[PDB]
Amino acid sequence: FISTQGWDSEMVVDYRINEDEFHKISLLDCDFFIRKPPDPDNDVYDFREMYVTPPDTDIYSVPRVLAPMPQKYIRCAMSDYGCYDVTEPPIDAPRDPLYKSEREISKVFLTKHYRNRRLNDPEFVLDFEEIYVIDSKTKSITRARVLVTVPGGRKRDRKDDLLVIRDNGNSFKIIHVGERDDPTTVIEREEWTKTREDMEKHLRKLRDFSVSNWF
């Protein structure tokens, strides 16, 4: 209907969109709207028209676009990125819960289906080279910069590659599925790096530090 492409990055629009012609993507600090062409699987996106709103509000504005956007329809799989906010709220009323567990979404990833194949297609794979990132803090949408380390180049067996996401959803690396790291290894690497720096900082103020070894 409307092409918001090339429009202001934060100005409000005069109208209220019909929300059932759009994908509604809810993040911690915004609602992101991307036009939805009709499709039985409901996973086709029209990025030419996009809006962003404060949560549970109907006052729409054009989001900041930090990368070139797809021009034709594309099929994408959606996954969210964030944390659990598990709290222990104060107990005011009788039988007030001992904890509250809520999910806080800071980023949403839209991963293109390879050649736009459907989920139920027997040849369905994801195209990790084309990923679009919605950020809640900046109310923006961008394309991820992906580093491919799999040998094969553009023409390769996409059934063998694994996407690794690190650094608050900012680093994207495609590796071979045989180079998969154990979850224990991932956790222990992070702990070793942090405790190694903290220990050296603690030991730095000892006056014989410069004539001592790590071991």
Partner 1 sequence: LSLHRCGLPREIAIELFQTFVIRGLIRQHLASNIGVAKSQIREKKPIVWEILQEVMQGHPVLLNLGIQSFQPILVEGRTICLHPLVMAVHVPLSLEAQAEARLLMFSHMNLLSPAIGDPISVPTQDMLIGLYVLTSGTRRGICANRYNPCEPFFCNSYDAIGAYRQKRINLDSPLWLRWQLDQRVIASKEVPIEVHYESFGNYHEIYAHYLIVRSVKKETLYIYIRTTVGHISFYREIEEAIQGFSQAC
Partner 2 sequence: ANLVFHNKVIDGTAIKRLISRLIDHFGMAYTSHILDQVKTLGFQQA
Partner 3 sequence: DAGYLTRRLVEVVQHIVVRRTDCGTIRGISVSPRNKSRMMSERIFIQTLIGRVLADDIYIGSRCVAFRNQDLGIGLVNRFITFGTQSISIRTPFTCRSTSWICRLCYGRSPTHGDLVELGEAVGIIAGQSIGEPG
Of 147-186, binders to partner 1 (CB under 8 A) are 158-166, 168-169, 177, 180-181, 183-186
Of 96-125, binders to partner 2 (CB under 8 A) are 96-99
Minimum Å gap between C-beta 92 and partner 1 is 14
Amino acid at 187: I
- Contact in structure between 78 and 108 (CB atoms under 8 Å): yes
Minimum Å gap between C-beta 184 and partner 2 is 16
- Contact in structure between 102 and 84 (CB atoms under 8 Å): yes
Q: Does the footprint of partner 2 cover residue 86 (CB under 8 A)?
A: yes
Query: Residue 195 in 3-state DSSP?
Result: helix
Helices (H), the chain: 183-203
Q: Does the footprint of partner 2 cover residue 88 (CB under 8 A)?
A: yes
CA distance 123 to 111: 16
The CA radius of gyration of the chain, in Å to the nearest whole number, is 22
Q: Which one, 91 or 147, has the nearer CB to partner 3?
A: 91
CA distance 92 to 100: 14
Query: Would you tell me which residues interact with partner 2 (CB under 8 A)?
Result: 86, 88, 91, 95-99
Query: Would you tell me which residues interact with partner 1 (CB under 8 A)?
Result: 77-79, 81-86, 88, 99, 101, 104, 106, 111, 114, 119, 124-126, 128, 158-166, 168-169, 177, 180-181, 183-196, 199
